[PDB]
Amino acid sequence: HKSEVAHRFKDLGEENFKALVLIAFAQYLQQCPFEDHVKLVNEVTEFAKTCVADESAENCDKSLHTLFGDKLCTVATLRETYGEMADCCAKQEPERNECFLQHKDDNPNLPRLVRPEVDVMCTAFHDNEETFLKKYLYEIARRHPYFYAPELLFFAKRYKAAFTECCQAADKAACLLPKLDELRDEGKASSAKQRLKCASLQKFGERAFKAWAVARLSQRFPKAEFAEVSKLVTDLTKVHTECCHGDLLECADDRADLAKYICENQDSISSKLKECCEKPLLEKSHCIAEVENDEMPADLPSLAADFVESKDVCKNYAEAKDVFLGMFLYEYARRHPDYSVVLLLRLAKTYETTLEKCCAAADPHECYAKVFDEFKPLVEEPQNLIKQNCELFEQLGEYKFQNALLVRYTKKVPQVSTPTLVEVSRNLGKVGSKCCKHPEAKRMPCAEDYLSVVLNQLCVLHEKTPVSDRVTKCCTESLVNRRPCFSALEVDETYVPKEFNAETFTFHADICTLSEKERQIKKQTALVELVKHKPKATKEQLKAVMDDFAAFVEKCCKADDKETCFAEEGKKLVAASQAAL
Ligand SMILES: CCCCCCCCCCCCCCCC(=O)O
Ligand SMILES: CCCCCCCCCCCCCCCC(=O)O
Ligand SMILES: CCCCCCCCCCCCCCCC(=O)O
């Protein structure tokens, strides 16, 4: 490997290379139009081929970062369009690439990407599949310049498959529009997981990330020995640390080294890696990162002997505290793939707190004898919440569950924006649909994973437009204490009922012509404003108003002169409601 471009061209293949080069340029030159990028990509790609033919051909022995930066420095308009970015070109290499990284604009001033109609889309897809897809890949790459390029490429190919299938189905939109929604939401979620892992690492440090990773790796690979699990956690932590810094190639090399290491030591890690490890380099690490938990060994004893009963608990602990705590987490974790990672972490902190206390007390052995009892309420807490909220979802269906949640959280934090209360409640309810379909034992991991993105989105919005101290508390706590801080929120008894607005509770006959989605949203917005206006209102009372409201909408979406019914019956609904409440 005298030629890093040649070697990359050979590993990836022409198609993948072209796409990844496009994404890379799109992420740095975020205001250059599609056609400049296509020219760059073809220039780099002709050049690549030259080095494949002959690794000694001129400039082929240069560094990927060298060639990338030289090409950025060739763009004629660099100073006029990107100002400071052009000053990077004056640097010699190690710092030039670090300079360009710094001048990527996260969330730049760009107008929202409007979804064309299905038949406009499918026609452009048929008419010129290549430019349709790549022009859209360019549009996403340039608005998400830190999005890991191959994860973005993985998404692109699922769009290609979605268009391929649904554009030749005789009912185009009912096929395609759902798949575009799932992709849009997986995209925003995966993006938000990235941004969350990197802020947690910054705030709380390496130890806390390594704790989290021990728990997760141990659930995944319950047959690995501890020393193999800690080797992995150390390499994971180096990988995550380098990928947060956001340099594409340094992240991609670290991720490949780890995937390579895992695929070579498969029989010391998990038996479910065969297929991932037969895939090409581009896809290996991604496949492994999503692999199912291995089945745990049958012969697994109690943790009591090593962690509670053994004399030498304090001595083994004091000799390497984190190592001992990590062993405890490893042994607990691999027996419980049914626990959320953060429940495992509460348990480990409990074990830690008790050892710190007990190993300095008169009789340590007696002191930590019953440490396992302290785990019981922590375990039961999220289990019981899932029991209760999934029972509710079983009774109500998704929509009516979402409305239960609206009432619940509007009352707890009625200063929150109505649009925000509505979105997070809809979203919480979808977490019910997804997670309450699992058997009891998969439910906690499902909840943890989807709640972490609903609650980050929550805390992101609130950082920007603060509203409640209590919410800021829950948002700035450890990721281990986030969800339970939110669960501990109580009804705000300080809230002054908001003033009646007539317009707020006036409806027009165009609600009959909205989608199911749009109707629901306008009703749920009404429900929030209802609770915001009458916060002491009882569930029985609330029900009585929603039944009449529901009755009202039906009647006037059935009437000759729809709009008169809305103004006239509405006068009767509003006055009836104001009486009863
Ligand atoms: C002339 C410079 C052009 C830019 C070169 C683009 C580099 C793309 C390489 C990305 C490596 C992708 C391999 C996947 C690694 C992984 O996630 O496991
Ligand atoms: C392979 C060993 C890695 C190190 C393992 C350390 C285990 C620590 C257990 C306590 C978990 C606490 C999670 C973060 C909370 C805090 O920062 O106090
Ligand atoms: C911008 C600020 C937004 C704040 C929105 C507050 C609404 C509360 C959301 C908390 C729900 C999280 C799940 C907790 C489950 C439970 O109730 O036990």
Side-chain angles (χ1 to χ4, degrees), residues 3 5-38 40-45 47-54 56-57 59-61 63-76 78-79 81-91 93-105 107-108 110-116 118-134 136-178 180-181 183 185-192 194 196-201 203-224 226-237 239-241 243-259 261-273 275-277 279-298 300-310 313-314 316-348 350-369 371-386 388-393 395-399 401-422 424-436 438-463 465-492 494-502 504-515 518 520-521 523-535 537-538 540-542 544-554 556-557 559-561 563 565-567 569-570 572-581:
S3 177
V5 306
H7 188 255
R8 281 263 150 264
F9 190 83
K10 287 197 223 126
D11 294 345
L12 267 354
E14 182 156 349
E15 298 307 316
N16 286 322
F17 181 88
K18 280 182 146 132
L20 289 158
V21 168
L22 176 58
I23 290 163
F25 285 122
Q27 291 184 321
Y28 286 84
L29 302 176
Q30 307 164 67
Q31 304 296 305
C32 298
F34 183 61
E35 294 80 14
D36 291 1
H37 293 279
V38 167
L40 296 178
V41 176
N42 292 336
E43 282 163 14
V44 171
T45 303
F47 171 72
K49 281 171 165 153
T50 253
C51 310
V52 169
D54 184 357
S56 304
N59 304 301
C60 293
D61 69 307
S63 172
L64 284 151
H65 290 132
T66 279
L67 297 159
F68 189 62
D70 286 359
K71 260 278 137 82
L72 258 20
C73 295
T74 70
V75 175
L78 187 60
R79 174 152 268 120
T81 318
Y82 307 91
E84 282 171 64
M85 172 169 298
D87 302 333
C88 303
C89 297
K91 298 184 169 56
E93 205 1 283
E95 307 97 302
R96 189 179 61 180
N97 177 240
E98 186 45 53
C99 186
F100 283 119
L101 257 197
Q102 291 163 347
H103 298 285
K104 287 172 143 185
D105 194 5
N107 256 219
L110 276 188
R112 104 214 222 319
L113 260 183
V114 306
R115 186 189 291 178
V118 179
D119 284 74
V120 202
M121 288 198 288
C122 290
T123 310
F125 178 82
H126 170 258
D127 271 12
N128 190 338
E129 187 175 16
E130 230 281 311
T131 77
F132 173 76
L133 291 162
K134 294 282 181 86
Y136 267 116
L137 181 59
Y138 149 88
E139 297 282 8
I140 315 319
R142 75 205 281 245
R143 292 166 175 74
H144 305 90
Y146 286 101
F147 201 101
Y148 188 57
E151 200 70 34
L152 189 43
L153 169 54
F154 169 79
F155 278 114
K157 295 161 188 302
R158 299 168 72 202
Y159 282 113
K160 176 167 240 204
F163 287 110
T164 292
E165 179 198 318
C166 301
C167 289
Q168 297 228 47
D171 187 8
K172 305 207 214 294
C175 185
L176 178 52
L177 256 107
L180 296 192
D181 283 5
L183 268 47
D185 299 329
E186 286 174 44
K188 294 208 307 304
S190 161
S191 181
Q194 272 152 103
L196 194 49
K197 301 197 155 155
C198 303
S200 347
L201 192 167
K203 272 196 278 174
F204 304 111
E206 256 187 49
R207 183 170 180 285
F209 180 83
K210 281 175 143 95
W212 189 84
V214 172
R216 191 51 167 209
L217 284 158
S218 289
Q219 284 179 321
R220 281 203 162 188
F221 305 136
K223 298 164 141 201
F226 174 77
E228 188 64 23
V229 171
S230 53
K231 202 271 172 182
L232 295 169
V233 167
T234 289
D235 293 355
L236 253 201
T237 294
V239 166
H240 279 251
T241 296
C243 298
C244 292
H245 186 264
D247 186 310
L248 170 58
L249 299 158
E250 302 301 326
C251 180
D253 292 329
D254 286 341
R255 291 183 99 247
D257 292 334
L258 179 56
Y261 174 83
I262 291 173
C263 288
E264 283 164 5
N265 292 265
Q266 220 166 125
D267 284 81
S268 127
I269 297 170
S270 154
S271 44
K272 298 186 183 179
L273 262 359
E275 329 77 357
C276 286
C277 294
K279 297 229 187 139
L281 159 98
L282 181 65
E283 303 172 349
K284 268 222 192 99
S285 69
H286 168 86
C287 183
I288 304 153
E290 252 183 273
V291 73
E292 205 145 314
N293 284 344
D294 198 3
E295 209 165 323
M296 84 190 142
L300 282 203
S302 164
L303 297 128
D306 296 321
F307 296 106
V308 181
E309 283 151 23
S310 140
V313 152
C314 291
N316 293 162
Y317 175 71
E319 188 170 341
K321 281 182 180 177
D322 291 354
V323 174
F324 194 75
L325 291 171
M327 278 162 186
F328 170 85
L329 235 185
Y330 158 77
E331 291 289 2
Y332 219 122
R334 67 195 185 124
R335 287 157 178 80
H336 289 274
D338 69 314
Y339 282 6
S340 38
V341 175
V342 298
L343 167 64
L344 286 161
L345 291 172
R346 295 170 198 126
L347 297 185
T350 298
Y351 189 60
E352 182 177 34
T353 305
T354 55
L355 294 198
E356 283 302 311
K357 183 187 81 193
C358 289
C359 289
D363 192 336
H365 183 97
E366 295 297 312
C367 184
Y368 53 68
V371 82
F372 278 29
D373 290 3
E374 308 173 45
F375 305 153
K376 178 66 140 190
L378 264 36
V379 177
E380 307 235 281
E381 137 89 25
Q383 282 174 342
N384 298 330
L385 287 186
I386 288 214
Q388 190 189 20
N389 285 285
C390 286
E391 226 194 344
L392 211 44
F393 175 93
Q395 297 147 54
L396 307 174
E398 186 193 336
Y399 172 72
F401 179 57
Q402 288 163 337
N403 297 345
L405 295 178
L406 250 9
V407 168
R408 184 150 91 211
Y409 304 119
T410 298
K411 285 173 144 147
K412 307 188 152 217
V413 205
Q415 301 79 11
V416 175
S417 197
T418 298
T420 294
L421 291 161
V422 169
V424 324
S425 285
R426 315 204 79 222
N427 288 353
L428 267 357
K430 294 210 287 180
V431 173
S433 301
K434 185 64 182 216
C435 297
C436 309
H438 284 308
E440 187 211 292
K442 304 198 106 205
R443 287 194 162 175
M444 204 185 299
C446 183
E448 157 172 58
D449 208 68
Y450 287 107
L451 260 35
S452 49
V453 302
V454 183
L455 268 27
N456 201 51
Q457 283 174 145
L458 211 61
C459 290
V460 160
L461 289 168
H462 194 260
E463 156 67 72
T465 2
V467 132
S468 164
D469 61 290
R470 291 130 75 230
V471 172
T472 289
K473 184 159 195 212
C474 299
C475 295
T476 53
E477 207 85 20
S478 22
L479 293 187
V480 169
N481 291 35
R482 178 173 284 197
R483 196 286 304 161
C485 184
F486 280 117
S487 305
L489 292 167
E490 296 174 79
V491 174
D492 181 359
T494 285
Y495 184 69
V496 190
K498 98 131 69 160
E499 174 71 334
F500 189 71
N501 190 253
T504 286
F505 311 103
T506 313
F507 315 94
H508 301 298
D510 66 0
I511 75 133
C512 318
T513 73
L514 296 167
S515 47
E518 281 283 77
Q520 289 181 353
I521 294 258
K523 295 147 116 202
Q524 286 166 336
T525 314
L527 191 48
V528 176
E529 295 292 343
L530 177 49
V531 176
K532 286 205 183 162
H533 174 59
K534 304 259 75 105
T538 282
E540 295 285 49
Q541 292 188 335
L542 260 41
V545 179
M546 299 176 289
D547 293 353
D548 293 349
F549 172 87
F552 155 75
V553 167
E554 155 147 36
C556 309
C557 299
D560 319 297
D561 192 352
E563 188 66 11
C565 186
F566 271 96
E569 297 285 78
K572 300 180 73 193
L573 184 60
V574 162
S577 303
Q578 288 178 94
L581 314 188

